[PDB]
């Protein structure tokens, strides 16, 4: 359910993710590095399962940030894919892919892979 | 089929992978980049399923190259995980993970991921 995902979240490296879950399955918000303030803020868009299996199954979700705002352009996009697990300590566990724009010859080393855990702090 | 893995294979960027498959599941050989020269070569070791399923399934396999030989040390290691498919046009379809040795500050950007298709052509 949307209410659970909506809020401010932080990962282990100190980045900020602010997200609103809409009732049609949409995710919208902003993503920031730990330096804080204005420009490290980038737009995110994503989708989540708005009718999850009951059980103690997580809610699957995913979102994308393209690393261009009005102050910087890193010519790259990251997608996070994972699941929301609710409880006292709500968490989002993800794996992510970072692709950079490259020339044809360097395309084989264009994509980084890694994983992030987000802890919630506010709605 | 099983030992059809033993041979010389090429990925889509011209790198060459020469492997011996042991009867009990060992994979041993060398990998070298295109450019050709006799040390762009690195040693590899791996494992494969030596008794695959009898329905039309591929044979699962994987191997590792640490990128150090007597000439270069790129302080990294790549692992390829995939499956061999026999037939008139045999191939090995893989995905790989390249990790570099980094400091803790750069650990989040230590690993690249990609995919390779090896054929005998």
């Amino acid at each position: 359910a949307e209410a659970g995902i909506t809020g401010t979240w932080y990962n282990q490296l100190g980045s900020t993710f602010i997200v609103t879950a809409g009732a049609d399955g949409a995710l919208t918000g902003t993503y920031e590095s730990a330096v804080g303030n204005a420009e490290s803020r980038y737009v995110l868009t994503g989708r989540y399962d708005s009718a999850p299996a009951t059980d103690g199954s997580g809610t699957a979700l995913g979102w994308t940030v393209a690393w261009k705002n009005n102050y910087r352009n890193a010519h790259s996009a990251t997608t996070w894919s994972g699941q929301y697990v609710g409880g006292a300590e709500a968490r989002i566990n993800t794996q992510w892919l970072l692709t950079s724009g490259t020339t044809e010859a360097n395309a084989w080393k264009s994509t980084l892979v890694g994983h992030d855990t987000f802890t919630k702090v506010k709605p | 089929a099983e030992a059809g893995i033993t041979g010389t294979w090429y990925n889509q960027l011209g790198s060459t992978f020469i492997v011996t498959a042991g009867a009990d599941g060992a994979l041993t050989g060398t990998y070298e980049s295109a450019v050709g020269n006799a040390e762009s070569r690195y040693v590899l070791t791996g494992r494969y399923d030596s008794a695959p399923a009898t329905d039309g399934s591929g044979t699962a396999l994987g191997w590792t190259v640490a990128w150090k030989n007597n000439y270069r040390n790129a302080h990294s290691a790549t692992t390829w995980s995939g499956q061999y498919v026999g037939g008139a046009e045999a191939r090995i379809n893989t995905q790989w993970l390249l990790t570099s040795g980094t400091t803790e500050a750069n650990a989040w950007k230590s690993t690249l991921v990609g995919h390779d298709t090896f054929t005998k052509v």
Binding site: - | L13, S33, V65
Partner: peptide, 7 residues
């Protein structure tokens, strides 16, 4: 970057 694995 530039690495031994390809080309």
């Amino acid at each position: 970057f530039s690495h031994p694995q390809n080309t």
